[PDB]
Amino acid sequence: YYWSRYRMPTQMPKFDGPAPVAAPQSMNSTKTNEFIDPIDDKFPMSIRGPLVRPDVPEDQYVDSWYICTSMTHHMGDYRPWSASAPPNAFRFRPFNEFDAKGREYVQY
Amino acid sequence: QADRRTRHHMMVDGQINPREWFNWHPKEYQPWYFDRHKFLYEQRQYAQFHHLLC
Amino acid sequence: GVHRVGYTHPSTLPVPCAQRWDLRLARARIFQEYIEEKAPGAWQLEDERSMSPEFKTFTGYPMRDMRPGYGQNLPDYIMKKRLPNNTHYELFARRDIPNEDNAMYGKYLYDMTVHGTSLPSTYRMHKDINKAQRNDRKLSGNRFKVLCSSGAKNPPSGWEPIPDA
Amino acid sequence: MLSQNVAKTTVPSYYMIRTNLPHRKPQNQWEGVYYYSGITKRQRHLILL
Amino acid sequence: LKIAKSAFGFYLARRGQRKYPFLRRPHIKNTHSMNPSAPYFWSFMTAKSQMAFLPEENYITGDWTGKFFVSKRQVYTLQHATSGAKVRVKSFPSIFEFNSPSRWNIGKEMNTLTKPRMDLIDEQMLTKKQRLDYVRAGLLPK
Amino acid sequence: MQQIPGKVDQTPFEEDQTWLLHSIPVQQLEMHHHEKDLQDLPFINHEQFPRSLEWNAP
Amino acid sequence: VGYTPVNPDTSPMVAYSQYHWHYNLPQGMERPHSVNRTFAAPFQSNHS
Amino acid sequence: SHRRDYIRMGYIPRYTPWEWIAIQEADQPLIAEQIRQDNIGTSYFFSLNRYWRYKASPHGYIRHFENEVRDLLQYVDGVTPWKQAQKIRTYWEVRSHHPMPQF
Amino acid sequence: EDGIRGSEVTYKIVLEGFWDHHVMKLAEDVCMFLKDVGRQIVEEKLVAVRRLLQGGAVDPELLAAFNCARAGPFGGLDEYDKEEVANFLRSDLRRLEEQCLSVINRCNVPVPGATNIYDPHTSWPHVEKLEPWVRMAEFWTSSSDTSFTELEMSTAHYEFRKFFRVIICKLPFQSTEFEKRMYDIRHWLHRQTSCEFHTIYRRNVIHDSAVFPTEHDPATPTTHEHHRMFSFALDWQSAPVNRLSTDTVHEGESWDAVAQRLGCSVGELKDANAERETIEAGVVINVPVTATRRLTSFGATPLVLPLKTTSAKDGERIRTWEEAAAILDCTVEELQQCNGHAALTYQKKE
Amino acid sequence: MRHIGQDVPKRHTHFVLESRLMYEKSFRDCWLHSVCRAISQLDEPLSKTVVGTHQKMLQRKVTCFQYNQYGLFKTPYYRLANVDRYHAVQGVAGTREWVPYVNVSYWTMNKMVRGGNLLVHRVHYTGWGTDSHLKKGGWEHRWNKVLQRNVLQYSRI
Amino acid sequence: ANINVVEKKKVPLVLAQMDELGVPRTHLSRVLMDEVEDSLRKFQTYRSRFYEWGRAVKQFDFIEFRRRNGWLYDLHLMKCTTKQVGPLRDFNDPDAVQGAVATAEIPAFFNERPAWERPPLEETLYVTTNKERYDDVRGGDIYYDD
Amino acid sequence: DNLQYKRYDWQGWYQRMLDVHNRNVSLRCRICDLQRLDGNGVQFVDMQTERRLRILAQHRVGMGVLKLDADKYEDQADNVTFGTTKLSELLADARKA
Amino acid sequence: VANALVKLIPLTRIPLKKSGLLSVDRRRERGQFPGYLDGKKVKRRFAKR
Amino acid sequence: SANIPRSVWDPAQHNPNWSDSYGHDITNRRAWPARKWTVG
Amino acid sequence: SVSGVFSKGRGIGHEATTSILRYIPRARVPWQPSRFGRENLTAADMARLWSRGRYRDGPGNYNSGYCTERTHVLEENTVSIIPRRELEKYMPDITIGPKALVTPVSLMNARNGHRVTHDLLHSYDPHIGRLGKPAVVDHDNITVEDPNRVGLNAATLDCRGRIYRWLRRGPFFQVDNYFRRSVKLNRDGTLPTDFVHEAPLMRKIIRLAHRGHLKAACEEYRRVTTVPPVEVYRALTACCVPGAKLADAVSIFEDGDSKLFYVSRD
RNA sequence: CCAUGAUAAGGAUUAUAAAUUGAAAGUGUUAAUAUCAUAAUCAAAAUUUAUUAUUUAUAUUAAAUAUGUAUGUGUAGAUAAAAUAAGAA
Ligand SMILES: [Mg+2]
Ligand SMILES: [Mg+2]
């Protein structure tokens, strides 16, 4: 069948047991997001920092289709900022002498 | 006018109605040729022996 | 000023030289060019918006001509105008149709090559299956509606429909 | 008869209506257009003769 | 739509009072087509140039059996008056006839000779509610 | 601007009044452009192929 | 879902599913196809 | 083809393998007109005038249609009796019988 | 020009994906492919060139091409000896070796830690960015028959996007083989990605002073009136004009009289007509293509057929149509087209 | 017909097919129509060769020919109905109820975008977008830039 | 496939050069011109044919030809792949439940049980048919190898 | 097209439509390379001839490169014919200087 | 001007930064949007049913 | 020429500056220790 | 009990074949065994069906001018038709006749493949306008009624697959079909080349080429509908010789050869 | 014409830092209940509908045909919108 393609190759994980630690469970009046992680948002911005995703040159991220979130165009691999620039590049920069605009008008 | 042979019936007389285009495994529509004028063992009823012919 | 436009033929000058208007007629013969006789000399107006680097909308070319009355009606407009043939309109005409696969191939052809047979549309199949299901319990909430009625009204010589109860 | 002649459709049901399973294969980008280059037995024979 | 005055009553939604781009409203309903102007008489709702030919619709184009009404963009010609032949136009409820021929019509399109929205109202095409609403606006007496 | 020789013509007016009191009309109906009419309105901006707006003919 | 079926080329919810290739994987050709080379048809037109 | 991990264990080639490029490219024909050979010259007189079925056809703007226009005129004139085209009126000729045609 | 800035042929391949990284990685793939294939071709060409540099003869034909001038810069027919010509040839081949070497040497720069395919100094072919196609769709998310306000308040923005990379390869010569590989990359392209091929090549055109002669402006000028709308369809022929290559010799005429009338040297007129030694009256002759006085087809002066003494059919007057049509060698229907008056009055031309 | 054995759930989808044929008729009639218009309305002389009484005569001859062409498609495009190839929902083009590059109505665009069928990208509902050109001058400017790369970058011959 | 066939595709380029060079193409042996004409009919086509070569009638006719010669294996429309290839376990965990991120149809010779693990010549000593269960299968695979 | 419009009944008309969308053939030459001795020893394009060339082809010259874009016919072949013709016709007229 | 001045005379950065010259405020007109009357801030008329 | 270029398969044409696949990308994701010095 | 749309119908194919052919079982479409198609309509019913389905222009519509009813009812009001003799008194008759509906072959490309300005689209292929028999377009007889029913009617019974076929047609479909259904080699091996209506045109071309007018000759060659005789190609190339035009001689030859049946190979 | 599904609108207390002032509770068109009927735009057309920001006094109808009506002391009752590159405590 054409549909023979859409079978499950592997046995899917069963639901054996209870809701996870600090699950959203709603009592008499509760405003509940299934979406927001209960434990990792409660954790202070001072400590964890404003980052939603790893701090990496953004070319590695893609704005997802159908999901409000970004993903990495190489699954899960990450290259640090240091790998975008030349070795020991001041403020990782193609060349250390000037900022982008400085480079433009020097060139002109 | 119409009757059991002509109408759409899932079942006729307690057994699956062979007259419905949708009561057959679609594979039965796939094209085939008439055998019968060929040599006995080439025919399709002997298919289990076909790998063996001489 | 209101003046008569004027032209000095080179034979009359105290040095022959090629007059710009004459050149203009050359250019009109080469790339065949309509010379609008009634074009008012006073009406030169560049399109400020697109032709001046001072506006954010600056394309460098005169996007529109600034003539208030100008309309699709006029022979002049008709003469410089892009015909609809092979534009996007044609592309819509062909690719945007109710069952997109009927753009790529005859359904019957496909069906007969892939499946052994023509297949009804999904909708039709639904009505078919339903008739079969509900003909199995109740009978005679029905009606007999055909395209051509003669086949039922005079049935063939044989054809004795099985009585039902 | 031919054992590669094989059902491409499922048994007709409401599962074709109520589900987003596709009714045909998606086109295969890297499969070339089928075209005719080839000769008959008869033709090869004609050439040899 | 609320009331179906035609088939389309079933297919179309009003969408409240909705704005369309300039001079494209889906349905061309020319309420203004007869809108008197002495000084603009020859330029208003007529041909933009007086050297234009009369439209298609003043001519018999093919082999005809006959017509019921002529189109409303047909222009009234001295022969319309003189010949004494039926001149009909499709208006509502049914058809408007030019019965009483005048030269004052000549050279204008019948769009312009046929009042689209009459000051006359049928009380029998109106629901009791609609009649109420026409009394509020001070149209119908009551 | 080149003009046809022998034709009586006018020069662009220097005085504001000359522009203002002449018989130049205002745009009144919907407005047309011989190329741009094929892409209907600015809001319906018809595009046959999705080429970069900066695409450059070779 | 409907009487009109989805067309598997234009729908990202088919194309990018687990049964097909997601847009974040590396997009190269999967396998080559030699059809015309392996078994070739002789030309016979429908028209003479 | 020796790589047993190809899609299973997660190895996907970043560059399409030479052998595959060869197969792909060897399946389809090459168009003859892509080869671009002109050693004679340009044909000024005959080329754009060739037989109608295969003809050079003008496109887009109406200027480019000069040939066609001539033909459409010739044809039109031939088919269309003056006896009939007499009867087509201009608005001013019609309006001349209105009691106040000019102001 | 030298180095990066000059070439015989340029190909630009414009790749287009639905996602930016797709098109980026495709461009790396295709780029490395053309690097290898390019190096192979250009290396082959380079060995051919090095062999041609080492030595070779000269075509009789190439020598003939250097020696076709009526006058060279020094004001006389110039004799290039085969030596000089070989020297021109050699100089060009020198330049072609420099260019080949330049392409090859950039093919060998981009190693694994060091690869930068954006700068043209560091790689062949290189890659240029091209601004993405982005269309924004604005629409009502509501289905409401009742209120326009509620429709407007629900408005979504979504975009269609298309992303582009450009691959530039400039080559010092033209090879149909490279062109073939390049057209064929469309068969192994990445998933849901397409491409265009821009070509800019160099090609000899030929300006014929014979077909497009340079002559004085006409004795009568052309007005603005030959330029009305539809003047393009009515008042003008397509260029080039047809100038006759064949002329008939009048009775009293002689070689030099004919040459004088046609605007040639007598030598020219004899070369074009080489078959004929002598020219009798009423003989057909070939007009040397350089002639200054050649006539255009159908001069503006109408041929008139007077009725006069006609044929022996009358010896008084010409009468029937088929008669004059036999005289002028044309169809009777054409003859009737031209004359409206004589066709309406009667057919016996009363 | 007469609602016997209808294949599609909406009967009106067929109208969409009818529409296609309209555009086809226009391709068949546009050039012809427009030439007859231009030659008809021309007040200046046609040319050096055709002037005066001949021109007047030829004009009338042509518009007589154009009126005689039965079924010649003269209807302006903005007066043709836009109807969906999917659900046969209609919308006015140039309005927020019609979506131009997919050529579907708002209703279908919504349905198709939310259950993923179209591939688009969501952008903040309130601005101009990701696109540079739209960001500069809005709809009109982008409209212009499209004109510029379709036409003006060519110096025609 | 056999790669080196691509070389024949040089031929319509060489032929074009032979015309630029004034080598008459009809002095070529009858033999060679047969091989060349073949090579041509593999890769050369004109702009004419090219506009028409994708019509569905011709694609499906080619399929019909393949069907009468009983070779359907490679054709796209006409093959139904059935067998799925399971994941590889890790001793780093039995626990981790794997799931498929993507799916590709690739020839079975990439991963096939190593020749020393599987029984000796299978084609010759075993008659195998892949077929579908008739009975309703609650869970597990709908195909089995008989 | 390699994607979608590659293989079925629409491959033909889409192909043709691209080809007609692409009819334009750009013809370039530098005015530099036009200044060369002609077969007759006279310079083919001199200063005056160049001035006349520039005035005749107006916006069709830029950066000292003459560029004709031939769009007239549906097929590229015919546009190189057309373009080439216009070029020699324009040179023929400029050469009057 | 202030950013240029800082690239030119490095130490001059400290007064500048303290007087909040180098500091960038992020503010924008609201994006256009057809829901609002004026296209920006003003919601349309409301009536109780 | 040849469909698969000599440079690919011929060891005479082996490029000594090419490195294997694994090495560069392992080397790349390295984040060296940020406290290289006292004080900072 | 029985509701039909049509009372009676007829067979597409005739006695000799059918009476014997019936002993061989034919497989009908499994899901709808009985087929009543537009070939099977009676003459009357076909006429009626064919009038409808054409919006306003079409003869079905009461106000098109082709209506045969003497009376029509708008909202309970009965309107009597105005006969055409009467309509003409104020509305002049400018009617060219059927030739006005057909442009020449020369314009077929301007018009996207058509010669026919009628209201239905006209295909030059056999199948789209096929009734029982193969479709054939008369360029002399084109009427609004369209008796042979070869036009592509948008709304009739059975239309849909025809419309779909028309929208799938290849880039040269109209042109190719028009060209191959006329212009084909005779059963004797003779060329189609000699036709009575085109003869004087070929003569004129030859004549023009002998006087050495290459451009005028080529300009007439353009207007040729049918394959031109060998003599034309001879004349035309002979004309190319004295001025050395080679490109032109070659494009002439190549035009007449392997396009036009190799008239040019001589 | 009875003939189930599904996306709207609708501010009321997770705040300033390297940061968005628009929500799930469902607004015609979408997938298993059938057993009165061809109602669909390709022009030029007939106001009763809660749900809509119109130009207010120097100069005023030219191209698809495009609105003739209400000057009345900025004047009842009752209502609308906004803290966002602006300036409100
Ligand atoms: Mg609901
Ligand atoms: Mg209908």
> What are the distances in angstroms from CA O150 to CA K38, O122, O135, O147?
43, 7, 6, 8
- Residue O115's CB is within 10 A of a number of other CB atoms, namely 21
Cα angle for residues B27, B29, B31 (degrees, 5° grid)? 100
Cα angle for residues N17, N19, N20 (degrees, 5° grid)? 155
| DSSP helix/strand/coil, I156 | strand
Q: Does strand P come within 7 Å of the CB of F10?
A: no
**Max intra-chain CA distance, chain K:** 75
How many whole angstroms separate alpha carbon L82 and alpha carbon H66? 14
Phi and psi at residue O73, in whole multiples of 5°? -110, 115
How many whole angstroms separate alpha carbon I192 and alpha carbon G10? 10
Q: In this structure, are residues K13 and I180 in contact, taking their beta carbons and an 8 Å threshold?
A: yes
What single-letter DSSP state applies at residue O227? Answer: P
Q: Does strand P come within 7 Å of the CB of J76?
A: yes
Question: Nearest Cβ partner of O5 from J2, J17, J67?
Answer: J2
How many whole angstroms separate alpha carbon I316 and alpha carbon J33? 53
* K75 touches G: beta carbon within 8 Å: yes
Q: Give O199's Cβ-side CA count (13 Å radius).
A: 5
Which pairing describes strands E87-89 and E96-98: parallel, antiparallel, or unpaired? Answer: antiparallel
Sorted by sequence, the CB contacts under 8 Å of residue C151 that are 6+ apart come out as O34
Locate F39 and state its tokens: 């892409």
Closest CA to O67 of J108, E54, E65: E65
Q: Does strand P come within 7 Å of the CB of C122?
A: no
Q: Does strand P come within 7 Å of the CB of J75?
A: yes
How many whole angstroms separate alpha carbon N6 and alpha carbon I240? 52
Sorted by sequence, the CB contacts under 8 Å of residue K14 that are 6+ apart come out as none
What single-letter DSSP state applies at residue L59? Answer: T
* K50 touches O: beta carbon within 8 Å: no
β-pair partners for I198: I12
How many whole angstroms separate alpha carbon O166 and alpha carbon O123? 8
> What are the distances in angstroms from CA J72 to CA O57, O111, O158?
10, 11, 25
* Alpha helix stretches (DSSP H) within chain A: 38-42, 45-48, 100-107
Give contacts of O1 with chain B, Cβ < 8 Å: 1
Q: In this structure, are residues J18 and O154 in contact, taking their beta carbons and an 8 Å threshold?
A: yes
Phi and psi at residue J139, in whole multiples of 5°? -55, -45
Residue written as token pair 């000019």: H102
Cα angle for residues M15, M21, M24 (degrees, 5° grid)? 135
Burial of residue I208, with CB atoms counted within 10 A of its CB: 0-12 exposed, 13-18 middle, 19 or more buried? middle
Give contacts of I192 with chain L, Cβ < 8 Å: 3
How many whole angstroms separate alpha carbon A65 and alpha carbon J120? 7
> What are the distances in angstroms from CA O112 to CA H89, J25, J30, L9, O159?
32, 9, 10, 19, 22
Beginning with the edge strand found earlier in the chain, give each strand of the sheet holding L61-62 in spatial order. Answer: L25-30, L65-70, L61-62
Nearest protein residue to the C1' atom of P81, measured from CA: M42
**Nearest ligand (C-alpha, residue O154):** 2
Locate I31 and state its tokens: 């780029």
| DSSP helix/strand/coil, C147 | strand
Q: In this structure, are residues I311 and I318 in contact, taking their beta carbons and an 8 Å threshold?
A: yes
| DSSP helix/strand/coil, I330 | coil
* E73 touches O: beta carbon within 8 Å: no
Cβ-defined contacts of I297-303 (< 8 Å, 24+): I297/I242, I297/I243, I297/I244, I297/O213, I297/O215, I297/O216, I298/O213, I298/O216, I303/I328
Buried b (16+ CB within 10 A) or exposed e, H35-71: beeeeebbbbbbbbbbbbbebbbbbbbbbbbbbbbeb
**Nearest ligand (C-alpha, residue I144):** 1
DSSP string for G14-45: HHTSTTS--TTS-----S---STTTS-PPP--
CA dihedral sign of residues O29, O32, O36, O38:
negative
Closest CA to E103 of E74, E76, E135: E76
Which pairing describes strands O2-6 and C144-148: parallel, antiparallel, or unpaired? Answer: parallel
Q: In this structure, are residues I226 and I59 in contact, taking their beta carbons and an 8 Å threshold?
A: no
Locate F45 and state its tokens: 């901006």
Amino acid identity of residue O132, one-letter, is G
Burial of residue E38, with CB atoms counted within 10 A of its CB: 0-12 exposed, 13-18 middle, 19 or more buried? exposed
> Resolution of this entry in Å?
7.8
C-alpha Rg value of chain G to the nearest Å: 18
| Distance, Å, A32 CA → P25 C1' | 14
Please name the helix (run of DSSP H) or strand (run of DSSP E) that holds residue I92, with its range, or none. helix I82-107
Cα angle for residues D11, D13, D14 (degrees, 5° grid)? 155
- Residue O40's CB is within 10 A of a number of other CB atoms, namely 20
* Residue I39 alpha carbon to ligand 2 centre in Å: 64
3-state helix, strand, coil in chain M (%, to 5): 35, 0, 65
> What are the distances in angstroms from CA I221 to CA I218, I224, J120?
6, 10, 62
| Interface H-N: count of C-beta contacts within 8 A | 6
* K6 touches G: beta carbon within 8 Å: no
E-strand ranges in chain L read: 25-30, 61-62, 65-70
Question: Nearest Cβ partner of C153 from O2, O9, O32?
Answer: O2
Residue written as token pair 């790349």: N28
Phi and psi at residue C13, in whole multiples of 5°? -85, 155
Burial of residue J52, with CB atoms counted within 10 A of its CB: 0-12 exposed, 13-18 middle, 19 or more buried? exposed
Locate O191 and state its tokens: 């060329």
**Nearest ligand (C-alpha, residue I143):** 1
How many whole angstroms separate alpha carbon O214 and alpha carbon I241? 10
Please name the helix (run of DSSP H) or strand (run of DSSP E) that holds residue O202, with its range, or none. helix O199-210
| Interface F-I: count of C-beta contacts within 8 A | 26
Q: Inter-chain contact J31–O5, Cβ cutoff 8 Å?
A: no
Closest CA to H73 of J22, E54, J42: J42
**Max intra-chain CA distance, chain M:** 67
Give contacts of F57 with chain L, Cβ < 8 Å: 24, 26, 69
CA dihedral sign of residues C56, C59, C61, C62:
negative
Which pairing describes strands C144-148 and O82-83: parallel, antiparallel, or unpaired? Answer: unpaired
Buried b (16+ CB within 10 A) or exposed e, I297-333: beeeeeeeeeeeebeeeeeeebbebebbbeeeebbbe
Chains interfacing with A (3 or more CB pairs < 8 Å): D, G, I, J, K, N
Closest CA to E88 of E99, E78, E79: E99
How many whole angstroms separate alpha carbon N9 and alpha carbon N12? 9
